[PDB]
């Protein structure tokens, strides 16, 4: 790219717990808990009771220390850079007997100049972290109140004080971890004249016919002369130049302003999954002395992005336009890969968004207790066409709002709003989760004097409605900003669900029954959820047999939710008859989570245009635990995302039973209208006899973008309550010519009142490596298979769906661990086999 040399610092890394003087190898970028659990001085902290057993880790102080050459010609360079991308998070950092850095902000990468401090030969780098507990222990003395931060698990709520992931400290899914570390990547960079300190790509407008594009850098010259240059920019596509720009400049000393318009004509569009191709723009600037001095590429995405938030008849829309078009919002939340950051692996981004590029997603939201995502998550939302909704990390509880508090925050939003403002993905800023719901609602009226309390909400003001917002609005001006998620909604409150974006606590926390998505809806679901236990092989993963109940002491560390397993049962027996055995009940509640949670999905897209967007809680989790994801730590997909998969399929025939009588709507999120359409539906029974003849509605269409009643009946006259115990409806949609576009299933009663025939489910397999296909078949219907194997994170084609009577079923499994002439194991459930 340039004449730079960068020098990774990632080997020959050591640590020592502070006061020993024993050190020991470790790993860079990584956290002190890794290091120990390497060497064997921690146990595995996500197995058994172990969660205990690891604490005292965060109450000691670490160093780290490694020795790096440099030689007599590197020291030549003009410049020497030392960028430390994350230090988690009070670190000391020294380099030959200089104090370099005092960090205090995990969010925040440093860029150090170290030219003038480095030795030909040897050179000693040592870092100091200070227990981000220990140091904010007088700091909470002089405090005299605790914060109300419940997530943080521990007597003192010191979270509050420091900038650092807040799930570190605990989370209702999560291990308390309360790590340290060089926590992203450590980098020396020996270079002549000048580096870009920055190269934001801004977009001044688009059209069909014209992209207009300013390139702003800034260049930081590090020698004292003046330096005449030639900036360019190449904007290329799949390798071929779309237009090259160049301006003369002199730079001077210190900082240096340079702008360059560019154009692309006709420009190619960057669309969200399901609407087109994330088209990816090579954008490319250098820095020319007579030598490419510097050079920083984006990759730029052409698009408009609009959050329109807006008074209207139903109180205050919130949707998002994309390229001109109101865009309804299908994903859901992200929460941290890993107790340990830097433990997630490109893989396991890569895979994650799979996953949500599989199920049909086009949002995520990186919710606020969490961290600002690496470039790489980013990236791979560009690439995807997921749209990305960032929270500040700031969730639940009031923080401080102290001059050097804010300067803290400032510093780290400048930083990420600089770092990820030039990607395709990014399409808003929230200030915080539920700060405003908590400091209206939580109760902290009564917990806190009258002063206290004032000074908490003055104290919101500073933070979320002054220094955020500006900040936004200098540095990404033309991203939406909002305050707070949900900004006014409350799910106890009707009068408040056409205002804004709702977080539906009533189901799960309220008790509320799945059919209340139905009736309660929102102007975009920004939050609801339903936990699950994970799958077997994810129990076994932290549990030994002995400790398979619901209630071991085993089990109960893996629950945060501390009136989680109770409302798990108490929503099965509503709809499901309740297992004897720990295996079936597991298998239950994923089917549960998994059919209660799409019909909410459900209610949200056909609901539209008054619902713009659901995203469910939550996508993932962070280590073996209980949970709202709808993937567990593993990779495993629970039913819930098979079904989020279905519920957000563009086209998707819904029907909708209610007052005894059933609505059929054809929803689409296609850019294209559907004309001269069929829907067929006939009813079954569970022996695969038709009752009846085929239903048909001809002459359909489906505009784009569009939820439509299609049909309606009553059930009366129709099918007797006994045959509402013993069938269902299946329902296809074709085009003029018969070609199926969609299909659905729909059963009449709840599953416990249904009266599912015994039966087996038999299947043929053939078995490769990377690979098996299997065969399914049984004479009656079996519900909600489950097709289980032992193989950790092995993925389905489907799975967690009805197998009709008499008609097979293909279902391919893969993964590198499967080997030829290794016959895997294969355990068929279904909801029959669950009950005597
Ligand atoms: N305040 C409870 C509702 N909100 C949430 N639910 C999740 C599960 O309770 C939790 O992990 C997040 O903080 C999220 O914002
Ligand atoms: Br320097
Ligand atoms: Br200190
Ligand atoms: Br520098
Ligand atoms: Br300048
Ligand atoms: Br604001
Ligand atoms: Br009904
Ligand atoms: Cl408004
Ligand atoms: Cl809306
Ligand atoms: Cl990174
Ligand atoms: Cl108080
Ligand atoms: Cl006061
Ligand atoms: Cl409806
Ligand atoms: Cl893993
Ligand atoms: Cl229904």
Same mark, same amino acid.
């Given at each position: 790219?340039?004449?730079?040399?960068?020098?990774?610092?990632?080997?020959?890394?050591?640590?020592?717990?502070?006061?020993?003087?024993?050190?020991?190898?470790?790993?860079?970028?990584?956290?002190?808990?890794?290091?120990?659990?390497?060497?064997?001085?921690?146990?595995?902290?996500?197995?058994?009771?172990?969660?205990?057993? %690891?604490?005292?880790?965060?109450?000691?102080?670490? &160093?780290?220390?490694?020795?790096?050459?440099?030689?007599?010609?590197?020291?030549?360079?003009?410049?020497?850079?030392? /960028?430390?991308?994350?230090?988690?998070?009070?670190?000391?950092?020294?380099?030959?007997?200089?104090?370099?850095?005092?960090?205090?902000?995990?969010?925040?990468?440093?860029?150090?100049?170290?030219?003038?401090?480095?030795?030909?030969?040897?050179?000693?780098?040592?870092?100091?972290?200070?227990?981000? /507990?220990?140091?904010?222990?007088?700091?909470?003395?002089?405090?005299?109140?605790?914060?109300?931060?419940?997530?943080?698990?521990?007597?003192?709520?010191?979270? $509050?004080?420091?900038?650092?992931?807040?799930?570190?400290?605990?989370?209702?899914?999560?291990?308390?971890?309360?790590?340290?570390?060089?926590?992203?990547?450590?980098?020396?960079?020996?270079?002549?004249?000048?580096?870009?300190?920055?190269?934001?790509?801004?977009?001044?407008?688009?059209?069909?016919?014209?992209?207009?594009?300013?390139?702003?850098?800034?260049?930081?010259?590090?020698?004292?002369?003046?330096?005449?240059?030639?900036?360019?920019?190449?904007?290329?596509?799949?390798?071929?130049?779309?237009?090259?720009?160049?301006?003369?400049?002199?730079?001077?000393?210190?900082?240096?302003?340079?702008?360059?318009?560019?154009?692309?004509?006709?420009?190619?569009?960057?669309?969200?999954?399901?609407?087109?191709?994330?088209?990816?723009?090579?954008?490319?600037?250098?820095?020319?002395?007579?030598?490419?001095?510097?050079?920083?590429?984006?990759? /730029?995405?052409?698009?408009? %992005?609009?959050? $329109?938030?807006?008074?209207?008849?139903?109180?205050?829309?919130?949707?998002?336009?994309?390229?001109?078009?109101?865009?309804?919002?299908?994903?859901?939340?992200?929460?941290?890969?890993?107790?340990?950051?830097?433990?997630?692996?490109? =893989?396991?981004?890569?895979?994650?968004?799979?996953?949500?590029?599989?199920?049909?997603?086009?949002?995520?939201?990186?919710?606020?207790?969490?961290?600002?995502?690496?470039?790489?998550?980013?990236?791979?939302?560009?690439?995807?066409?997921?749209?990305?909704?960032?929270?500040?990390? +700031?969730?639940?509880?009031?923080?401080?709002?102290?001059?050097?508090?804010?300067?803290?925050?400032?510093?780290?939003?400048?930083?990420?709003?600089?770092?990820?403002?030039?990607?395709?993905?990014?399409?808003?800023?929230?200030?915080?989760?539920?700060?405003? &719901?908590?400091?209206?609602?939580?109760?902290?009226?009564?917990?806190?004097?009258?002063?206290?309390?004032?000074?908490?909400? !003055?104290?919101?003001?500073?933070?979320?409605?002054?220094?955020?917002?500006?900040?936004?609005?200098?540095?990404?001006?033309?991203?939406?900003?909002? !305050?707070?998620?949900?900004?006014?909604?409350?799910?106890?409150?009707?009068?408040?669900?056409?205002?804004?974006?709702?977080?539906?606590?009533? $189901?799960?926390?309220?008790?509320?029954? +799945?059919?209340?998505?139905?009736?309660?809806?929102?102007?975009?679901?920004?939050?609801?959820?339903?936990?699950?236990?994970?799958?077997?092989?994810?129990?076994?993963?932290?549990?030994?047999?002995?400790?398979?109940?619901?209630?071991?002491?085993?089990?109960?560390?893996?629950?945060?939710?501390?009136?989680?397993?109770?409302?798990?049962?108490?929503?099965?027996?509503?709809?499901?008859?309740?297992?004897?055995?720990?295996?079936?009940?597991?298998?239950?509640?994923?089917?549960?989570?998994?059919?209660?949670?799409?019909?909410?999905?459900?209610?949200?897209?056909?609901?539209?245009?008054?619902?713009?967007?659901?995203?469910?809680?939550?996508?993932?989790?962070?280590?073996?635990?209980?949970?709202?994801?709808?993937?567990?730590?593993?990779?495993?997909?629970?039913?819930? !995302?098979?079904?989020?998969?279905?519920?957000?399929?563009?086209?998707?025939?819904?029907?909708?039973?209610?007052?005894?009588?059933?609505? $059929?709507?054809?929803?689409?999120?296609?850019?294209?209208?559907?004309?001269?359409?069929?829907? &067929?539906?006939?009813?079954?029974?569970?022996?695969?006899?038709?009752?009846?003849?085929?239903?048909?509605?001809?002459?359909?269409?489906?505009?784009?973008?569009?939820?439509?009643?299609?049909?309606?009946?009553?059930?009366?006259?129709?099918?007797?309550?006994?045959?509402?115990?013993?069938?269902?409806?299946?329902? %296809?949609?074709?085009?003029?010519?018969?070609?199926?576009?969609? &299909?659905?299933? !729909?059963?009449?009663?709840?599953?416990?009142?249904?009266?599912?025939?015994?039966?087996?489910?038999?299947?043929?397999?053939?078995?490769?490596?990377?690979?098996?296909?299997?065969?399914? +078949?049984?004479?009656?219907?079996?519900?909600?298979?489950?097709?289980?194997?032992?193989?950790?994170?092995?993925?389905?084609?489907?799975?967690?769906?009805?197998?009709?009577?008499? =008609?097979?079923?293909?279902?391919?499994?893969?993964?590198?661990?499967?080997?030829?002439?290794?016959?895997?194991?294969?355990? %068929?459930?279904?909801?029959?086999?669950?009950?005597?």
């Amino acid at each position: 790219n340039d004449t730079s040399e960068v020098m990774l610092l990632d080997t020959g890394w050591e640590f020592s717990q502070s006061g020993t003087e024993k050190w020991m190898p470790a790993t860079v970028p990584g956290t002190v808990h890794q290091d120990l659990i390497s060497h064997e001085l921690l146990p595995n902290p996500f197995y058994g009771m172990n969660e205990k057993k %690891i604490q005292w880790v965060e109450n000691e102080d670490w &160093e780290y220390r490694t020795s790096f050459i440099v030689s007599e010609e590197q020291l030549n360079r003009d410049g020497i850079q030392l /960028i430390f991308e994350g230090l988690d998070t009070y670190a000391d950092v020294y380099l030959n007997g200089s104090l370099l850095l005092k960090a205090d902000n995990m969010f925040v990468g440093y860029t150090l100049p170290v030219k003038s401090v480095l030795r030909k030969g040897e050179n000693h780098l040592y870092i100091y972290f200070h227990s981000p /507990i220990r140091q904010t222990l007088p700091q909470y003395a002089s405090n005299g109140f605790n914060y109300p931060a419940d997530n943080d698990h521990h007597e003192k709520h010191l979270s $509050v004080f420091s900038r650092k992931a807040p799930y570190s400290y605990g989370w209702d899914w999560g291990i308390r971890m309360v790590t340290s570390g060089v926590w992203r990547p450590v980098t020396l960079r020996f270079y002549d004249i000048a580096t870009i300190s920055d190269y934001y790509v801004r977009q001044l407008s688009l059209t069909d016919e014209n992209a207009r594009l300013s390139n702003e850098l800034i260049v930081n010259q590090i020698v004292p002369q003046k330096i005449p240059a030639e900036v360019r920019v190449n904007v290329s596509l799949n390798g071929t130049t779309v237009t090259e720009v160049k301006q003369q400049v002199t730079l001077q000393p210190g900082i240096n302003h340079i702008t360059l318009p560019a154009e692309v004509t006709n420009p190619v569009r960057w669309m969200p999954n399901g609407w087109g191709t994330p088209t990816l723009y090579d954008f490319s600037a250098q820095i020319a002395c007579g030598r490419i001095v510097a050079e920083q590429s984006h990759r /730029i995405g052409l698009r408009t %992005i609009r959050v $329109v938030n807006e008074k209207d008849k139903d109180g205050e829309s919130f949707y998002f336009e994309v390229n001109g078009i109101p865009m309804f919002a299908k994903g859901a939340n992200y929460i941290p890969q890993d107790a340990l950051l830097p433990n997630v692996t490109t =893989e396991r981004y890569q895979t994650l968004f799979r996953d949500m590029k599989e199920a049909n997603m086009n949002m995520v939201r990186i919710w606020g207790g969490g961290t600002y995502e690496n470039n790489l998550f980013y990236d791979l939302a560009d690439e995807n066409g997921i749209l990305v909704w960032q929270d500040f990390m +700031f969730a639940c509880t009031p923080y401080p709002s102290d001059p050097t508090f804010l300067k803290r925050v400032e510093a780290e939003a400048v930083y990420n709003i600089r770092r990820l403002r030039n990607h395709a993905s990014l399409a808003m800023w929230c200030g915080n989760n539920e700060i405003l &719901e908590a400091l209206k609602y939580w109760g902290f009226e009564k917990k806190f004097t009258p002063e206290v309390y004032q000074g908490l909400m !003055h104290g919101y003001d500073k933070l979320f409605r002054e220094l955020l917002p500006s900040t936004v609005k200098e540095f990404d001006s033309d991203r939406f900003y909002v !305050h707070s998620s949900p900004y006014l909604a409350n799910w106890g409150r009707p009068e408040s669900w056409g205002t804004g974006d709702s977080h539906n606590w009533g $189901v799960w926390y309220g008790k509320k029954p +799945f059919e209340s998505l139905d009736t309660d809806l929102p102007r975009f679901m920004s939050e609801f959820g339903f936990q699950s236990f994970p799958e077997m092989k994810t129990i076994a993963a932290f549990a030994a047999p002995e400790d398979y109940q619901i209630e071991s002491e085993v089990m109960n560390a893996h629950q945060k939710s501390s009136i989680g397993n109770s409302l798990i049962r108490t929503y099965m027996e509503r709809d499901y008859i309740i297992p004897e055995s720990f295996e079936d009940f597991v298998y239950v509640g994923l089917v549960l989570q998994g059919q209660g949670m799409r019909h909410g999905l459900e209610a949200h897209r056909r609901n539209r245009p008054y619902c713009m967007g659901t995203l469910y809680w939550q996508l993932n989790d962070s280590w073996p635990v209980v949970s709202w994801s709808s993937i567990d730590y593993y990779g495993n997909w629970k039913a819930l !995302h098979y079904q989020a998969k279905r519920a957000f399929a563009p086209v998707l025939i819904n029907p909708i039973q209610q007052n005894d009588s059933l609505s $059929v709507y054809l929803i689409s999120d296609r850019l294209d209208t559907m004309e001269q359409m069929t829907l &067929e539906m006939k009813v079954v029974d569970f022996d695969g006899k038709t009752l009846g003849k085929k239903i048909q509605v001809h002459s359909l269409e489906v505009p784009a973008n569009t939820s439509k009643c299609v049909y309606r009946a009553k059930l009366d006259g129709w099918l007797t309550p006994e045959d509402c115990r013993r069938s269902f409806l299946k329902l %296809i949609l074709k085009d003029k010519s018969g070609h199926q576009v969609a &299909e659905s299933v !729909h059963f009449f009663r709840k599953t416990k009142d249904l009266q599912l025939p015994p039966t087996s489910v038999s299947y043929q397999m053939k078995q490769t490596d990377g690979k098996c296909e299997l065969t399914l +078949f049984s004479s009656m219907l079996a519900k909600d298979i489950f097709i289980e194997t032992p193989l950790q994170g092995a993925r389905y084609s489907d799975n967690f769906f009805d197998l009709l009577p008499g =008609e097979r079923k293909k279902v391919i499994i893969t993964s590198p661990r499967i080997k030829k002439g290794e016959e895997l194991p294969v355990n %068929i459930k279904h909801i029959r086999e669950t009950y005597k």
